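Final report, closing paragraph on structural work. Over the funding period we assembled a curated collection of sequence-structure pairs, and we close with a single example.
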Amino acid sequence: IQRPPKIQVYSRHPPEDGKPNYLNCYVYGFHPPQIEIDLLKNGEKIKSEQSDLSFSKDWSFYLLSHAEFTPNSKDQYSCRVKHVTLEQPRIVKWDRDL
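Its predicted structure, as stored:
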């Protein structure tokens, strides 16, 4: 029981300032299943397009939240996850050089 979530913030296509992309936040390997995931632009939240809760032997419970977004050299994004294993909501930033 009590397993913290593993997170992956990434974009669908290699980003270029201008072309509309998609930002996905992959969260998995956690338990219990109740978990909240917010997508953030400069600190405030955006498109809550979330998948349906799924489970697997190899990654326990997992989810995928995504939003359409347009890259700029000034706007920064990140994924915020809230789970009973995190004393304070964990925030992972979208690094676009990884």
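DSSP finds no helices and nine strands in the chain. The two ends are 31 Å apart (CA to CA). We thank the funder for supporting this effort.
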